[PDB]
Structure 1
């Protein structure tokens, strides 16, 4: 429709509605040859129109069409630079430079066109408009000559701050693309660091950090002194001064870049945490800033610099202790985490230790857990401090019994890493009288296990005094070794599954009764194998469902209805009609509740689906007296077979003697056959069809779902006003679901016929692990008045591309709509 575009642009109007037509055209994709055609037409129409807005829209649409996927833009660059040659409007010129930047970015390999484009950018950099200079600097930054550094350094000193930011970001892009920068850049960015604009200062401090990282060991002179300073130290001082900026995002940027200057000398590192050149007190100022983001960024800068420099961590220590009590919870979480990170070899003295143990008493569980891992990773002398830590942990356990596992982990790590210090404390912890026979302490009392976990982990690395234990302490040691062994210290199935499957396959020549008996035996064995080997459970019930499909097919094909005529057929004792429906349900369950399926299994699944459809066709043909509905779904079945041969034509030569290839042999007869004869030949040809083989997947699991938050074991009704809503929270443990975002659905079933199906949003499908998903929705329930609190049925469902199948355990919730 390129000629339609030509006609509509040159035939309706010039000034205004042409812009509307271009706007309407810009919203549809164009194929690459048609991209070339419309580019030629629009560039021909560019010279005709003298309206600048129409030409701006033309330039934008050229830039959009140059970004199409399959279109190589090498043939349109010359006309583009030709229309830049005689373009006077600055906005249209800026849009044209944007188009040229898209052209250059789409073709990185061609060096000649890149040199041409940077020549155009260098030509147009002297434009009076700031937008043209901005786009030309972006063009130089994106392409360059990896001369360009000198020109961008010249444009660091432009009058417009936007052009200055464009130049700094362009040369940062040059460094990021791979180009190595000069050193005069450092002086220019140092001059530009005191700019009156926020964005210029942020870009300049980024450039200062980059040029410091490029040449850390370079020696530069002080402007006001004879002494010489390393480049990384001087840039560290500049960024430390930028930490005290008036803009909070500039402070965050300065702190974050300050964290990555690991090559700074130690002297400036002790300077930056002091309170008495320009680096003095930078982190002290950053840790007390009003914006919590700056404090967080200074915390990570402290963490990185203390990980780099071990002598810095001792100075970091007391500031982290002071900033544990911070008004923002995320800030104190970060402070505790970084304190744990930098606690590799430094010891805690008394006041820092009991400040940590004082903030252990906090009501938030998150910082309590974080402080628990800090106590796991802490090193401490002065064993009375260890006793104080144990007392504070025990009273935390009394105040918060839910954290007993974390507290036991703390005491395991404290005993395992401070063995000699716990050793004199043992008679004070275990109430061991020197001569009295002490009463046996109550086991399963979480304070006493907490003491024993500390003691036993101390006794592991020190065998000097394990004889301080009494007899009941040794008995409790045995009990904890049996129960808490992770804390206290001191393929036949696959072969059987293959053998059972090949036993089924190799005995497919028996009588129908023997085949049913063999299939029942192997289904029972596969079910019990799934109940025994957990990692083979998915493949076990996968093959069990396949053999159940085959068993249902065999039992349906050996019914008493084939021995009676069509008028004498009676459906009130029928079995095959339910069998075909069951095979359909099992095939859908097989295809969609199994994670490890592939095409080599989907083809057999669809083959069994075809066999079930044929069986249902013959069953329905038994009970139909009219000729045209039978002909109708016979034609529908042959259409389904044609769709199957079209979709799965690649792996057709693997299904020897099966249903579908024996259909394909008789297919030209099948189009020309009378539909009752088609039904008869299908009935006689299902019984002669050979049983297929399942290619076993390497890794396959059932999609499992259980909900725990409705918790259908409480008989207390959930009361609300009739006609209003009541909210129900669910917590689903989805296991091995491939795409739970678009397949898992919540079904609520009221006691009447209402079966409202709820689609959860993707925002609350939490993924805490590989193959593990968590579903937390607040489903909404409403109905009018009930005379008694009946029930409601909550069920998870799996949806596929046409129907839905049950997915989880049915759970009943009591609901009592009271009248208003």
Structure 2
């Protein structure tokens, strides 16, 4: 159809470059065929291919490949492409287009044997070109159509052929063959060495990846992995930094090696000069170039140091001197690798400079990482414990904000090794051997920091409750009272589903006691509503389902009050004024159904069709009220037509669950539907009135532990009487910082609404980078809101609130905040 029309248009136009390029571009950019007509389009393209303009032919071949990407065609297109490749030897462009079409056909769908890939591979092998025509493309063809787990001769020749581009394509094919397996051999190792020596860029970069992969395949040459590793290091000392980054990451991926060869790599020093005072691979690869190769080197070192239980000291010094690397990424990665290798590790002298490291200007990340290092480290000496304590107290008294991390790292230190601190107990806390020492301060953070270390030490060793004083006894009582997760339980002499069932029972009570007086229904509904509200406050994990069923019961009570309104007792033509609690009920009940559908997180289609039933009931009540108030027979006819149309939409959407609805308003109305088509709207609304008066009450199946969304703006605070000041017409940027809890699709649903006090609403959408996701189902919105207006006489209050939009309407689910805004006029 469309393809035949396009072919006819192309044949009718027959302009040389112009109509051909225009038709090809239109056919490609319009749409996919999305049908079986792709074969007919390919047949028409193959018929039209017997012409001039090989550029247009290549574009047609690319279009054929793009059409084959939808996986409609297979063997017939394969045979046609084979014929075209056999009979279309016309220069590099058409050869490349044929190669690309062959790759698309091979990788598109079949991935099978029996002339699905083997025939194409043989065709590529026979049609290897003479000068850069297909060579790279046919190499990647054989890579992606590797034959079987039984090409090695021809890839060996194509390693030593002319073009470095062809060499790199062969190497990429080697990547593909290894990731498909194929079990390469040791002649590949030898030719990979001679490809490491290739005098040219990036050929080296991928060939050294090949030498890594054959070395990790098998270590059998004479020592194969040691020779490969030495080649890797002598390649690390190359000038090219991309090559070096590749080199360091791959040698880190290498995991087993001769240990003595590893110390030969680390061999050259002021480290051993300082060690006596107390008593060339990596040594160029760390301080050779900047932070790319530095990070790659430290990740290599962490991986192989986690591999080797030995060897760690000779990189321990090489990290402790290479903290201050003037790039904070390198700093953080150095601390992280020291953590990850800090096992069976002593720091008998390095504690001094590694704690001069934690003394630091602001560097909040660095100081936190060093606290983690000190909590996960090991030490050997009592003096080291003492000085670690004294400069940790320096840090706490200098930056009194990360005291929480200080206390937790002291806790981990005491838990890690308790017995070191035992001689310090008389010294660290002043306990004068006969005097009554004055009582220490209780909430002094330094004293807390020492006390938590003491108790974490006293977890195991029992020989210091006698060392404790009486203030220490009551302070252990207070600290165990206050910080439950920082101090453990000790042995001091002084200190030696009902909810779900009840919810189900109350709901089934209402469901059973449905068949009684409207008044008694009202009091039962009110009682159970405030009951479930109390339960939702009472517990947390039942709060969502409790509030959901509670607002459903509020919905039902609202509709029953609207029905029991005295408007029905009073005669029809009056409808005075202001008694339309029914109409206000209709608006509230529609809003509550929307809220009940969208603001909650876990809803399933049974609940959803119950919601839509209730929404139909709401529309019916609204139609009844407007029928009561409206005199125009044609507005009545229009409203009746729209209401019945929506009923038809409901049943068409929910064909299902009609057996689940028993004695239902909607299903009984569907039974009486054709008579509503026949009858005048007056008796329609009369029957609808009585019908819904004695319709039903549906059961609402309670689902699993669902939650309702909750938005809380923590910034701005909004208690500030200091106004935010600017000049007229100019804008002030106000950050909005809010916590969202249990929201699906947050970047598309949560929108900011600002009310300007002249009464207008501005709706600001946040960009989807403003929704950080620190955990599961709990998000943080950090955004800018741009406020501007003309000048005001005094400061006023601008409202900021978080609206939730669906798909159609918006629902507030956040507490509003007031921000004081005052624009000045121009200064001159």
- Give the TM-score of the pair, scaled to structure 1: 0.96
CA deviation after TM superposition for structure 1 residue 53, in Å: 1.0
Q: Retained in 1: the 8 A contact 2:102–2:120?
A: no
CA deviation after TM superposition for structure 1 residue 117, in Å: 4.5
Q: Does the C-alpha gap of structure 1 residues 87 and 482 become closer, same or farther in structure 2, counting only changes over 3 Å? A: same
Q: Retained in 1: the 8 A contact 2:351–2:384?
A: no
CA deviation after TM superposition for structure 1 residue 328, in Å: 0.5
1:241 matched to which residue of 2?
234
2:520 matched to which residue of 1?
514
CA deviation after TM superposition for structure 1 residue 462, in Å: 1.1
Structure 2, unaligned stretches of length 5 or more? 269-274, 490-496
Q: Retained in 1: the 8 A contact 2:42–2:64?
A: no
- Match of 1:466, SS state, is coil
- Match of 2:296, SS state, is helix
Q: Does the C-alpha gap of structure 1 residues 407 and 117 become closer, same or farther in structure 2, counting only changes over 3 Å? A: farther
CA deviation after TM superposition for structure 1 residue 26, in Å: 0.1
Q: Retained in 1: the 8 A contact 2:665–2:696?
A: yes
CA deviation after TM superposition for structure 1 residue 195, in Å: 2.1
Q: Does the C-alpha gap of structure 1 residues 121 and 430 become closer, same or farther in structure 2, counting only changes over 3 Å? A: farther
- Match of 2:667, SS state, is helix
CA deviation after TM superposition for structure 1 residue 446, in Å: 0.8
Q: Retained in 2: the 8 A contact 1:357–1:389?
A: no
Q: What is the alpha-carbon distance in structure 1 between the residues aligned to residue 797 and residue 131 of structure 2? A: 72
Q: What is the alpha-carbon distance in structure 2 between the residues aligned to residue 485 and residue 294 of structure 1? A: 45
Q: Retained in 1: the 8 A contact 2:541–2:705?
A: no
- Match of 1:737, SS state, is coil
Q: What is the alpha-carbon distance in structure 1 between the residues aligned to residue 9 and residue 360 of structure 2? A: 79
Q: What is the alpha-carbon distance in structure 2 between the residues aligned to residue 176 and residue 145 of structure 1? A: 14
Q: Does the C-alpha gap of structure 1 residues 131 and 564 become closer, same or farther in structure 2, counting only changes over 3 Å? A: farther
Q: Does the C-alpha gap of structure 1 residues 659 and 121 become closer, same or farther in structure 2, counting only changes over 3 Å? A: same
Higher mean alpha-carbon deviation, 113-122 vs 448-457, is at: 113-122
- Match of 1:131, SS state, is coil
Q: Retained in 1: the 8 A contact 2:35–2:72?
A: no
CA deviation after TM superposition for structure 1 residue 318, in Å: 0.6
CA deviation after TM superposition for structure 1 residue 495, in Å: 0.7
Q: Does the C-alpha gap of structure 1 residues 33 and 294 become closer, same or farther in structure 2, counting only changes over 3 Å? A: same
Q: Does the C-alpha gap of structure 1 residues 90 and 615 become closer, same or farther in structure 2, counting only changes over 3 Å? A: same
2:612 matched to which residue of 1?
606
Q: What is the alpha-carbon distance in structure 1 between the residues aligned to residue 785 and residue 384 of structure 2? A: 51
Q: Does the C-alpha gap of structure 1 residues 512 and 70 become closer, same or farther in structure 2, counting only changes over 3 Å? A: farther
1:584 matched to which residue of 2?
590
2:322 matched to which residue of 1?
323
Q: What is the alpha-carbon distance in structure 1 between the residues aligned to residue 614 and residue 72 of structure 2? A: 41
CA deviation after TM superposition for structure 1 residue 9, in Å: 4.2
Q: Does the C-alpha gap of structure 1 residues 376 and 131 become closer, same or farther in structure 2, counting only changes over 3 Å? A: farther
Higher mean alpha-carbon deviation, 279-288 vs 154-163, is at: 279-288
Q: Retained in 2: the 8 A contact 1:237–1:278?
A: no
Higher mean alpha-carbon deviation, 82-91 vs 573-582, is at: 82-91
Q: What is the alpha-carbon distance in structure 1 between the residues aligned to residue 132 and residue 443 of structure 2? A: 76
Q: Retained in 2: the 8 A contact 1:238–1:278?
A: no
CA RMSD of aligned residues (A): 2.7
- Match of 1:707, SS state, is strand
Question: 1:670-695 CA deviation, whole Å, 9 max, x = no partner?
Answer: 11121122111111111122111112
Q: Retained in 1: the 8 A contact 2:229–2:251?
A: yes
2:6 matched to which residue of 1?
4
- Give the TM-score of the pair, scaled to structure 2: 0.95
Higher mean alpha-carbon deviation, 333-342 vs 387-396, is at: 387-396
1:309 matched to which residue of 2?
308
Question: 1:376-422 CA deviation, whole Å, 9 max, x = no partner?
Answer: 11101111111111111111111111101100011001111121111
Q: Retained in 2: the 8 A contact 1:745–1:757?
A: yes
CA deviation after TM superposition for structure 1 residue 72, in Å: 4.8
Q: Does the C-alpha gap of structure 1 residues 216 and 603 become closer, same or farther in structure 2, counting only changes over 3 Å? A: farther
CA deviation after TM superposition for structure 1 residue 120, in Å: 4.2
Higher mean alpha-carbon deviation, 545-554 vs 267-276, is at: 267-276
CA deviation after TM superposition for structure 1 residue 74, in Å: 5.7
CA deviation after TM superposition for structure 1 residue 187, in Å: 0.9
Higher mean alpha-carbon deviation, 266-275 vs 769-778, is at: 266-275
- Match of 1:178, SS state, is coil
Q: How does 1:74-153 map to 2 (within 5 A)?
A: 75-120=77-122, 122-124=124-126, 126-146=128-148, 148-153=151-156
Q: What is the alpha-carbon distance in structure 1 between the residues aligned to residue 789 and residue 557 of structure 2? A: 44
Q: What is the alpha-carbon distance in structure 2 between the residues aligned to residue 503 and residue 89 of structure 1? A: 85
CA deviation after TM superposition for structure 1 residue 629, in Å: 1.2
Q: What is the alpha-carbon distance in structure 1 between the residues aligned to residue 304 and residue 653 of structure 2? A: 61
CA deviation after TM superposition for structure 1 residue 47, in Å: 3.1
2:272 matched to which residue of 1?
none
Q: Does the C-alpha gap of structure 1 residues 265 and 168 become closer, same or farther in structure 2, counting only changes over 3 Å? A: same
Question: 1:37-56 CA deviation, whole Å, 9 max, x = no partner?
Answer: 44334433443321111101
Q: What is the alpha-carbon distance in structure 1 between the residues aligned to residue 361 and residue 197 of structure 2? A: 44
Q: Retained in 1: the 8 A contact 2:38–2:67?
A: no
- Match of 2:594, SS state, is helix
CA deviation after TM superposition for structure 1 residue 523, in Å: 1.0
Q: Does the C-alpha gap of structure 1 residues 464 and 277 become closer, same or farther in structure 2, counting only changes over 3 Å? A: closer
Higher mean alpha-carbon deviation, 273-282 vs 561-570, is at: 273-282
Q: What is the alpha-carbon distance in structure 1 between the residues aligned to residue 716 and residue 441 of structure 2? A: 36
Q: What is the alpha-carbon distance in structure 1 between the residues aligned to residue 75 and residue 745 of structure 2? A: 38
Q: Retained in 2: the 8 A contact 1:9–1:21?
A: no
How many residue pairs get aligned? The number is 810
Q: What is the alpha-carbon distance in structure 1 between the residues aligned to residue 608 and residue 279 of structure 2? A: 69
Q: Retained in 2: the 8 A contact 1:94–1:135?
A: yes
Q: Retained in 2: the 8 A contact 1:360–1:371?
A: no
CA deviation after TM superposition for structure 1 residue 191, in Å: 0.7
